[PDB]
Design a protein around this nucleic acid. Structure first.
Lengths: 301, 248, 55, 55
RNA sequence: GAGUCAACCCUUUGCUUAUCUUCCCUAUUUAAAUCAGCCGCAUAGGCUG
């Protein structure tokens, strides 16, 4: 009775595009140029722990690089993102079980989710290592033929902002059952003159190179998956460990190999079954269980 | 034939190139058939002829072992091991820019159809892809067969896909003639008895395997007669060409 | 004459290639890095020091 | 300085707490001297009459 | 549905000896390139800082 379904699916509500990278001047923003990739060679020793003997051998390697031209000082990262509604409508599996979760939900505040998503977009968390060493970071966003210029900073010390509230409310209304909205992100940055640039890598079986860079017809670009992971890092719903992480069931990032949200009564599937059998829970956890539901995917097993 | 709608320079992102366990690259025409019937059921118009073209197509990676995507834990069987090196599940992706040209018959208006088709396209998927940017679709008019060449003078340039036929079986013929395979359809083998985990409880459940046909990518001007590029549903869940066997 | 950096490519026509950005002699941005951080004057002997690296 | 890019919550923090008791002035001075002395300019300097650095 | 951090590729070098390219040729016909300016939805004298 009320057996947990082993097959359930939901659509990708947030669709990011392929981020594209350009070099443009600070004061000559009319004329821009693409950034190539090229290939170069390196020759470094071996720095391997616990191997004193192999310190006297060389090593020749070949890698791809990317950086601003000899005379440019502005990096331009531009892409498009799409928010769609149709939430709580299963696309593969479930016709009489999603509604049983619906009658428990709709008590959550989508405005907070929209505020956090737009704040993540505006602050610049979509750029991982490009922000190290830049004094000025600004963006311009054009949605529904109206434009907004943001110079937001200070990803830390979260504070209420009323200048970004209107777009957050718009998209929050969009999520609770509407069509689609498209946002153009046009991040401008002034990292420096000739400094290195960091586009997304991809790994291949051992080949002639050892560090390949993502290329779109002779131009560096960023993967969609990384941007999507940037969009969905809002999880501030546990008592410690500030600088929140991305949202997913059994939420734990392998990059640094941390194990958060383990089998210590804070998971995804552990919640609704105890909610329907017993009393409800705090407003904090409905937030989380709808956050990871908005991201599309297949759940079950 | 009366009305054709054309959309060009459609940028699609993150296409799932693993069409089958052996075919990686251009998506099969069966997805085009599925999208066409979905458009037919949604908008409410019967569509007979389907046409498409390729402009740009780049596969993420190199000459071999193109691209691998890191999959994380998304199953309720974790908690202890879910802290390092989630399973890999290799599945390459790609990127592309395509175009479409469809036939539609409707006499109530002329622009409402454009509105609804654009609205549907804005919220669709292309073999796991995502529409990035597309041109405004435009309308063309045709009357009968002799003036049909006009349309080939209306939407250049692109490539065309034409049937050439197979002799006995393709296992060696594909290598010998150095053309490319493609899945023209599916052949049913047995019936799936179980009806538990299906998305519906009334649709019959059958098991099928792909069938391979020969197509070739050429220039439009090198095509003598256009009817070789039309696709029509055939007997036994097959798709055929109007003109039949290619001849000079 | 000058001396820019050199590449080690597979068996091609050339025998001693040179680094260039759009056809312009240049040096890699790690030879300069190796030149900046050669201050390790902090072992038992051997003045005219070496760079800083483990082992 | 003193924060690892990948991992490290207790080892790196303890290592930091042990550190920042030394002098950064010596390291900065040696780095800037290596920049100014021209040692960053590799063996083009052989057979040089007179050189200058503008920083 | 996150491939993520780090790096000195260096030294040396004789490319050189000779060479006939050559005969023939009808580019034909037609052509049009035309001082925003006050009250006036007007190609009838113009009193305008």
């Amino acid at each position: 009775k009320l057996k947990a379904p082993a097959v359930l699916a939901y659509s990708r509500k947030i669709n990011p595009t392929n981020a594209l990278m350009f070099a443009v001047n600070w004061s000559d923003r009319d004329n821009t140029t693409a950034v190539m990739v090229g290939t170069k060679t390196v020759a470094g020793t071996q720095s391997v722990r616990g191997n004193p003997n192999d310190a006297d051998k060389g090593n020749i390697q070949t890698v791809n690089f990317a950086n601003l031209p000899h005379n440019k000082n502005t990096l331009l990262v531009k892409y498009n993102v799409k928010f769609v509604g149709d939430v709580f409508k299963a696309e593969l599996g479930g016709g009489e079980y999603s509604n049983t979760l619906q009658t428990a939900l709709e008590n959550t505040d989508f405005g907070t989710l929209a505020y956090r998503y737009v704040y993540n977009i505006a602050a610049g968390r979509t750029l991982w290592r490009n922000r190290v060493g830049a004094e000025s970071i600004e963006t311009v966003i054009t949605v529904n033929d109206q434009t907004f210029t943001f110079s937001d900073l200070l990803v830390n010390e979260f504070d209420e902002d009323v200048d970004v509230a209107e777009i957050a409310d718009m998209v929050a209304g969009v999520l609770s059952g509407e069509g689609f909205v498209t946002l153009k992100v046009e991040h401008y940055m002034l990292l420096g003159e000739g400094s290195e640039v960091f586009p997304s890598q991809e790994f291949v079986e051992n080949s002639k190179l050892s560090k390949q860079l993502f290329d779109l017809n002779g131009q560096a670009a960023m993967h969609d998956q990384k941007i999507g992971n940037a969009i969905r890092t809002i999880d501030t719903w546990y008592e410690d460990a500030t600088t929140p992480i991305a949202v997913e069931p059994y939420g734990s990032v392998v990059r640094n190999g941390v194990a958060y949200r383990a089998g210590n009564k804070t998971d995804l599937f552990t919640l609704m079954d105890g909610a329907v059998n017993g009393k409800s829970l705090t407003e904090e956890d409905q937030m989380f269980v709808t956050a990871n539901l908005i991201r599309g995917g297949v759940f079950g097993g | 034939m009366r009305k054709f709608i054309i959309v060009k320079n459609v940028k699609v992102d993150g296409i799932n190139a693993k069409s089958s366990d052996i075919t990686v690259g251009m998506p099969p025409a069966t997805t085009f058939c599925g999208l066409g019937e979905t458009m037919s059921i949604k908008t409410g118009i019967v569509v007979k002829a389907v046409s498409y073209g390729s402009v740009k197509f780049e596969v993420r990676g190199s000459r071999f072992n193109t691209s691998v995507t890191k999959f994380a834990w998304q199953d309720r069987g974790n908690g202890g091991k879910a802290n390092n090196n989630s399973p890999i599940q290799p599945k390459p992706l790609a990127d592309g820019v395509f175009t479409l040209c469809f036939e539609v018959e409707w006499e109530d208006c002329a622009e409402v159809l454009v509105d609804k088709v654009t609205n549907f396209i804005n919220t669709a998927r292309i073999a796991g892809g995502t529409i990035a940017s597309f041109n405004k679709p435009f309308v063309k008019v045709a009357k009968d067969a002799e003036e049909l060449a006009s349309v080939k003078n209306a939407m250049m340039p692109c490539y065309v896909v034409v049937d050439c036929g197979v002799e006995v079986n393709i296992f060696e013929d594909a290598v010998n003639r150095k053309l490319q395979p493609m899945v023209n359809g599916y052949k049913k083998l047995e019936k799936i008895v179980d009806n538990k985990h299906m998305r519906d409880k009334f649709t019959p459940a059958y098991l099928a395997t792909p069938t391979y046909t020969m197509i070739g990518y050429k220039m439009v001007s090198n095509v003598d007669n256009f009817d070789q590029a039309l696709w029509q549903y055939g007997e036994n869940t097959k798709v055929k060409t109007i003109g039949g066997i290619y001849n000079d």
